[PDB]
Design a protein around this motif. Sequence first.
Motif, PDB file in Angstrom:
ATOM      1  N   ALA A 297      92.224 -47.352 -29.022  1.00  0.00           N
ATOM      2  CA  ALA A 297      93.108 -48.101 -29.954  1.00  0.00           C
ATOM      3  C   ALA A 297      93.543 -49.484 -29.428  1.00  0.00           C
ATOM      4  O   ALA A 297      93.772 -50.412 -30.218  1.00  0.00           O
ATOM      5  N   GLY A 298      93.655 -49.605 -28.099  1.00  0.00           N
ATOM      6  CA  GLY A 298      93.994 -50.852 -27.426  1.00  0.00           C
ATOM      7  C   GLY A 298      93.037 -51.959 -27.794  1.00  0.00           C
ATOM      8  O   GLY A 298      93.453 -53.043 -28.183  1.00  0.00           O
ATOM      9  N   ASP A 299      91.744 -51.674 -27.654  1.00  0.00           N
ATOM     10  CA  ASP A 299      90.702 -52.593 -28.048  1.00  0.00           C
ATOM     11  C   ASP A 299      90.808 -52.978 -29.518  1.00  0.00           C
ATOM     12  O   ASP A 299      90.710 -54.141 -29.851  1.00  0.00           O
ATOM     13  N   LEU A 300      91.000 -52.008 -30.408  1.00  0.00           N
ATOM     14  CA  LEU A 300      90.983 -52.306 -31.843  1.00  0.00           C
ATOM     15  C   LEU A 300      92.075 -53.262 -32.274  1.00  0.00           C
ATOM     16  O   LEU A 300      91.782 -54.204 -33.031  1.00  0.00           O
ATOM     17  N   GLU A 301      93.313 -52.975 -31.830  1.00  0.00           N
ATOM     18  CA  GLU A 301      94.506 -53.777 -32.093  1.00  0.00           C
ATOM     19  C   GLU A 301      94.386 -55.149 -31.453  1.00  0.00           C
ATOM     20  O   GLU A 301      94.477 -56.188 -32.112  1.00  0.00           O
ATOM     21  N   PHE A 302      94.213 -55.142 -30.139  1.00  0.00           N
ATOM     22  CA  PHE A 302      94.390 -56.348 -29.363  1.00  0.00           C
ATOM     23  C   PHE A 302      93.183 -57.264 -29.379  1.00  0.00           C
ATOM     24  O   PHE A 302      93.206 -58.316 -28.763  1.00  0.00           O
ATOM     25  N   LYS A 303      92.130 -56.857 -30.074  1.00  0.00           N
ATOM     26  CA  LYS A 303      91.017 -57.736 -30.369  1.00  0.00           C
ATOM     27  C   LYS A 303      90.994 -58.131 -31.849  1.00  0.00           C
ATOM     28  O   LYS A 303      91.613 -57.474 -32.709  1.00  0.00           O
ATOM     29  N   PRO A 304      90.283 -59.222 -32.151  1.00  0.00           N
ATOM     30  CA  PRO A 304      90.181 -59.637 -33.546  1.00  0.00           C
ATOM     31  C   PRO A 304      89.509 -58.563 -34.415  1.00  0.00           C
ATOM     32  O   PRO A 304      88.690 -57.755 -33.904  1.00  0.00           O
ATOM     33  N   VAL A 305      89.864 -58.568 -35.712  1.00  0.00           N
ATOM     34  CA  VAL A 305      89.287 -57.652 -36.707  1.00  0.00           C
ATOM     35  C   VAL A 305      87.770 -57.477 -36.561  1.00  0.00           C
ATOM     36  O   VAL A 305      87.252 -56.376 -36.783  1.00  0.00           O
ATOM     37  N   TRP A 306      87.061 -58.551 -36.180  1.00  0.00           N
ATOM     38  CA  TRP A 306      85.591 -58.482 -36.046  1.00  0.00           C
ATOM     39  C   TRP A 306      85.101 -57.453 -35.055  1.00  0.00           C
ATOM     40  O   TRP A 306      83.988 -56.964 -35.184  1.00  0.00           O
ATOM     41  N   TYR A 307      85.921 -57.092 -34.074  1.00  0.00           N
ATOM     42  CA  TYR A 307      85.492 -56.068 -33.133  1.00  0.00           C
ATOM     43  C   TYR A 307      85.353 -54.746 -33.894  1.00  0.00           C
ATOM     44  O   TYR A 307      84.284 -54.135 -33.908  1.00  0.00           O
ATOM     45  N   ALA A 308      86.410 -54.339 -34.580  1.00  0.00           N
ATOM     46  CA  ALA A 308      86.381 -53.099 -35.348  1.00  0.00           C
ATOM     47  C   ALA A 308      85.203 -53.110 -36.334  1.00  0.00           C
ATOM     48  O   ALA A 308      84.503 -52.106 -36.506  1.00  0.00           O
ATOM     49  N   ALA A 309      84.995 -54.261 -36.964  1.00  0.00           N
ATOM     50  CA  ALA A 309      83.908 -54.453 -37.893  1.00  0.00           C
ATOM     51  C   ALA A 309      82.530 -54.254 -37.214  1.00  0.00           C
ATOM     52  O   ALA A 309      81.594 -53.653 -37.798  1.00  0.00           O
ATOM     53  N   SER A 310      82.424 -54.720 -35.973  1.00  0.00           N
ATOM     54  CA  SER A 310      81.173 -54.635 -35.231  1.00  0.00           C
ATOM     55  C   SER A 310      80.774 -53.173 -34.889  1.00  0.00           C
ATOM     56  O   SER A 310      79.560 -52.843 -34.825  1.00  0.00           O
ATOM     57  N   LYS A 311      81.786 -52.321 -34.677  1.00  0.00           N
ATOM     58  CA  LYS A 311      81.586 -50.896 -34.405  1.00  0.00           C
ATOM     59  C   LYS A 311      81.080 -50.204 -35.666  1.00  0.00           C
ATOM     60  O   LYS A 311      80.307 -49.237 -35.597  1.00  0.00           O
ATOM     61  N   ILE A 312      81.552 -50.671 -36.816  1.00  0.00           N
ATOM     62  CA  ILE A 312      81.167 -50.064 -38.079  1.00  0.00           C
ATOM     63  C   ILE A 312      79.754 -50.518 -38.383  1.00  0.00           C
ATOM     64  O   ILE A 312      78.897 -49.727 -38.798  1.00  0.00           O
ATOM     65  N   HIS A 313      79.498 -51.779 -38.084  1.00  0.00           N
ATOM     66  CA  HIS A 313      78.163 -52.298 -38.218  1.00  0.00           C
ATOM     67  C   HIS A 313      77.118 -51.548 -37.416  1.00  0.00           C
ATOM     68  O   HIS A 313      76.080 -51.191 -37.967  1.00  0.00           O
TER      69      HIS A 313
END
Lengths: 419, 419
Positions: A297-313
Motif C-alpha cells: 500500500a505504501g507504494d500505491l499511495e506514495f507514488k503517482p497514480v500511474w504506478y497503480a495503473a502500470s500494475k493493472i496494465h
Amino acid sequence: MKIEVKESTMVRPAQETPGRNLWNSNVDLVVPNFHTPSVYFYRPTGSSNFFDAKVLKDALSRALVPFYPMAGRLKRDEDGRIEIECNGEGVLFVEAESDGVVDDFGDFAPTLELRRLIPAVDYSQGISSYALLVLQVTYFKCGGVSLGVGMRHHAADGFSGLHFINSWSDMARGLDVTLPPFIDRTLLRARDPPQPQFQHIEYQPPPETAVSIFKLTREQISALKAKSKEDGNTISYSSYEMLAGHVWRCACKARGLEVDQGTKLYIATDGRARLRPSLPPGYFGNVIFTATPIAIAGDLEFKPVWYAASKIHDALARMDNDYLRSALDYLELQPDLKALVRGAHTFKCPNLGITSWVRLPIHDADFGWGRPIFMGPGGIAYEGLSFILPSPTNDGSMSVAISLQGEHMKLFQSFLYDI
Amino acid sequence: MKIEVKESTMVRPAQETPGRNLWNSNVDLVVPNFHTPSVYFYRPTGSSNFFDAKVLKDALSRALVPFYPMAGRLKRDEDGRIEIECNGEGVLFVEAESDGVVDDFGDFAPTLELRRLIPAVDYSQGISSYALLVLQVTYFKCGGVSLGVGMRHHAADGFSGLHFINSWSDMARGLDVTLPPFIDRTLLRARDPPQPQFQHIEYQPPPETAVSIFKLTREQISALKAKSKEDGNTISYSSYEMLAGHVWRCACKARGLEVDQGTKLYIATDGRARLRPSLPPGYFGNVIFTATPIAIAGDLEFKPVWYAASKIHDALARMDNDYLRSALDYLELQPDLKALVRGAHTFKCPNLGITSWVRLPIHDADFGWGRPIFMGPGGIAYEGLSFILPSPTNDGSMSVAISLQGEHMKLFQSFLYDI
C-alpha cells in the motif's frame, strides 16, 4: 416505498425446443450461484401501451427459441458435474407496481433498496427447482418503468446475458435476432492431458456498509489520463488503466492501510478476443478470466497514480492465449471447482475487486419505447467491490459504483475527485 | 585475536600501461561504493614458501597489465559522471599476521570478525584518493592463510572481480591469463532516444544483529526440490528456485509477519547471457540487474514452498533482453543515479535480499599451493541479506549465509532444516 407483486408467469419458449444436456466448461463452473443482478430505468413517452406486459411476454417467448438453453434447468451428470438440462421449462416474468416514483431512487446507487426491483429466488430447494433467469417489470406512479434482471451464472456471463436481453428487446420491436447465439462450450475443453504453465493465484482460496455511485465527466477522465506525465514517466496508459489505478489507490488511501501492507486487486477480463483462435461471434457461455495484480500500500499511495495503473496494465497484458489455456488446464486438475469461488472474504479490506461494464452493451435494450436512462448493478453483495459504467448518453463520462465501510466513504469521495 | 599489519605496498602494473578515461555504464553507476568483500581460506601444505608474499606481489603486478583499469582511480567528467582514470597508480597489498589460528573462525560465518581480514579504507578523502582494489594476505599460527578482498563496485561486478583474482592466481603458477578481459562498457549505452517499456520498481527508492551460515547437503537440496509435487502441482522448479523460495519463506515465518503483510525479495541477476547479442566473453564491468518478486506473507507461509519458488521463477524469466534494454533506458532518464542505490533500508524486515554465488568461480584461485577450503562473504553489512554458496568440494551441498535479528535466528534455523 413498498413494492407489490401483481402477476407472475413462467414464460416458456413460443414453440417446442430441442432437448440436450448442455456441458459446462471449467470457467462456467468457477462462478458464483447468481450474477450481479442488473437494473434498467426508462422514462414514460406518453404512449398508452408503454411497456405493454403482453407485448413483452410474447417477445420473451419468441426469444427463448434461439436461446433455448436459457429456459433450461441445472442438473448433474453421472460425475456430479453441473450441466444445463434443456427442457424448455422457461423463465420467470414478474409484473409489479409501486406507489413511489423513479426519482425516488436519485443517483441510482446500487444499495439494498434496488434488490427489491429484482425477484427473490428460493435457491434452497435443490438445483433443478429454480429458473436460470428471473425478470421483473415494475410500473411507477409517474409513468416510469424499471426492468430488473437476475441470472444464475452457470448459464452465461454478462456479455452473453446482455446478448439475450438485447435480442429480446429487438423482438419486441418486431425484429429477429441480429446475431444468433452459437451454443457449444466444448470449445473451452482443457487440453488432454492438462498441462498448466503458470501458478494461478486468482483460483487459490485464501488460507456498517455504504454503497455509492460517483460520476466523473469526460473532462475529469481526460485530466486523469494526463497524469501519466508525472515525474517524467514516458509510458502512456489507457483511460481505463488510469481510472482503475486511481480507484484502487483511492480505496487504499481512504481505508488508511499501513505502508507495509499488501493489497490484491481482482480484475474481471473477457477472454473472447484474447483466445486463439477466437470464439465464434455470439458464443453463448462464460468467458471471464481473472487478473490479480499485487502491491504494498505504501507504494500505491506514495507514488503517482500511474504506478497503480502500470500494475493493472501488466497483469492484463499477461492474459494472453497461453495464460488462458493454462488457466483452463489448471482448473481441469483441481478436485473441487465450487471451493474456488470468490466469496465475501475475497474483497474485504485491504483487498478490492473491480469490474468494468464499459465495453458491455448495457444501454441497447430498446423495447420500442426508447433506450434506458440508466442501467446498473441492482445491489452490491460485498464490501470492496466496485463497478465502472459507461455513460447512458455517450458523453464521455463514467461512473464508479462501490461499496465500502461507511467510515471510508467520505474520504473515498474526497480522494476520487482530487484531479 | 588481534590482527597486526606487517607490510603495505601500492602494487603498480609491471610495466607502463596506456591512459584512458574509462566510461561507466548506467549499471556501473547504480552500485554501492564497495562490493561485498570476500575471503578465502587455504590450508598449509608443508612447503616452505607457502604463499610467498614476493611471488604474489610480482604476480599481481603482471596481472595488472591486461587488467590495467583495476590499477586506476575514480574521477568525474565535465558532467559530474564517474569514470575510471587509467593512471596506473595501482592496488593495495597488505601483509598481516595473527597469533590465533584458522579454526578460530569455525563455520566461517560472515560476522564482523571477518571484516578484520580485509583492509579498512579511508573513503573520506575524495573519490580519487583510494584504490579500487585492496587485498590482504594474513598468515596464521598453524600455517594457514586467508586472502581478503575489497573492490570498489564502480570497477566491476563479482563475475569480473573474480575473473581478475583467478587470473592473478594463474600468473602466480607461471601461466598467462587464460581469457583476456574485453574492456569497453559502451556496449551498455542506453538507446537514443531512451524509451523504457516497463516500470522498474527495482530502481525506485522506498518513499541486535546475528549472522550465520547453514550447510545443506546434496540430499537435503534434493529432498527439498522434490517438494514441487505437493498438492498435485505439476510444474517443476529448479534447485535454486526451490531453495531461494524456501529461504524467503523461512525468513517470513521466523520473523513472524502478519497474514496481510507485504514482502519484497530482491534478487541479483547476471545479464551476461540474457542480453542479445550477448557480451564478449571476459567483458570487464558490471552487469547485474535486479528482479523483485512481491508477496503477501500469508500466501508464502500457508502455501507450499513451490509457491514462493514460482514467484522467483516468474520474476527471473521476465529478465529477458527487452527487460534489460528497457532497464538501461529507464536509468538513462533518471536525474540522479546514486539516489537509486539500495541502502540499509532496502533489506530490513519484512523485506529480504538474496544473492547466489553458485555459478561464480569462487574456488578457482590456486596460487600454486592448492584451492581454498572456503571462500565467502567477509562480513554482512545489512540485516535481511543472504548469500548462497556452492560447495568448496563439488559434493552437491550448498550453504546459506544470512544476517537477521538475533531473535529470529533460532526459528530461522529450525525452519530451514525442516525438510
